[PDB]
């Protein structure tokens, strides 16, 4: 009569070798990530039956080195269903 | 009669080898990511039955090195359904 | 009678080898990403039954090196359905 | 008659070796991530029957080094269903 | 007649060796993560039958080094179902 | 007649060796994580039948080094079901 099934099957398989060999003297300098962000500063939404998905993301500085080598499923998601105002499924 | 099935099958398979060998002296300098962003600064949405998906993203500086070598499914998603104002599915 | 099925099958398979070998002394300099963005600065939406998808993205500086070598499904999505004002599916 | 089944099967299998060998003197300096973010500073949502998913994320500075080498499922999710205004599934 | 089954099977298997050998004198300096965030400072939601998922995250500075080498399922989740306004599943 | 079964089977198996050997004098300095966050400072939700999941997280400074090498299932979760306004499953 009714069958409601919410399933998520995530099968991730990685086979790899990361061999990193430095045989000689080296120098790395990635210094100085100081972005100055000044937003909406130093200056002189929805109604009754609705569905609203709003995202504000502010990041000053992000820096990834030698990372996420294999099968990086970070922050994975699915089927975002933002319904508003009343849902009705009916069979007669 | 009713059957509502929300499924997501993610099967990721990577087979690789990353061999990185430096046999001689080297120098790398990626310094100086200080973008100055000044937005809406230093200066003298929706109604009753609606669905609204708004995204504001501000990033000052992002820097990825030697990253995400294999099968990078980072921030993956699907079927974003932002419905507003009342949904009705009916059979007679 | 009613059957509503939201499915997403993502099957990604990569087989590769990244062999990077430097046998001699080298120098790399990618310094100086300081774009100055000044937006809407230093200066003297929708009504009742609607669906609105608005995106504002501001990035000062982005820099990817030696990244995303194989099968990069980063930020993947599908079926964005922003409905407004009331939906009705009816059979008699 | 009714069968409601919410399932999530996550099978992640990684086989890899990360061998990192430095045979010579080296120097790394990634100093200076002091982004100055000043947001909405120094300056002189939804109604009755609704579903609302709002995210505000502010990060000053994020820095990942030599991390997430294999099978990184960090912050993984699925089937976000934000329903509002009353749901009714009915069979006769 | 009714069968309601909420299941989550997470089977993670990693086999890897991280051998890190430094045979020569080295220097690493990642100092200076003091982002100054000043938000909504120094300046002169939902109604009756609804489901609302709101997240505000503020992080001053995050720094991960030599971490999450294998099978990092940190902060994993699934089937977030935020229902509001009264649910009714009925068979006759 | 009724069968309601909430199950969670988490089987994590990691086999790895982390051998870290430093044969020469070294220096590491990661000092200076003093982000100054000043939020909503120095300045001159939901109604009757609803389900609401709100998270506010403020972290001044987080720093992980040489951590979470294998099978890190820290803060793992599943099937967050925040229902509001009265649920009724009925068979006749």
Residue numbers in the entry:
A (entry chain C), B (entry chain B), C (entry chain A), D (entry chain D), E (entry chain E), F (entry chain F): 9 to 52, 61 to 108
Source paper text:
The first patient (FOR103) showed strong cardiac involvement and fibrils were isolated from a biopsy that was taken from the abdominal fat tissue. The amino acid sequence of the FOR103 fibril protein was obtained previously based on cDNA sequencing and mass spectrometry (MS). Comparison of the mutant patients’ sequences with the non-mutated GL segments led to the identification of six amino acid changes in the fibril proteins of patients FOR005 and FOR103, and fourteen in the fibril protein from patient FOR010. FOR103 amyloid fibrils, by contrast, are right-hand twisted. The dominant fibril morphology from each sample was structurally reconstructed to a spatial resolution of 2.92 Å (FOR103) and 2.25 Å (FOR010), based on the 0.143 Fourier-shell correlation (FSC) criterion. The reconstructed three-dimensional (3D) maps were fitted with molecular models that depict polar and C1-helical fibril structures that consist of single stacks of fibril proteins or protofilaments, similar to FOR005 fibrils. The swirl is defined by the position of the central arc of the amyloid key relative to the N- and C-terminal ends of the polypeptide chain. The swirl of the key is right-handed in the FOR005 and FOR103 fibril proteins when oriented as shown in Fig. 3b, and left-handed in the FOR010 fibril protein. All three fibril proteins enclose a number of buried cavities, but only the FOR103 fibril protein contains a cavity that is lined by polar and ionic amino acid side chains and which is large enough to fit a number of water molecules. The FOR103 fibril contains even an additional cavity that is surrounded by hydrophobic amino acid residues. This cavity is filled with density that does not originate from the polypeptide chain, indicating that it contains a hydrophobic inclusion as an integral part of the fibril structure, similar to the previously described λ1-derived AL amyloid fibril structure from patient FOR00614.
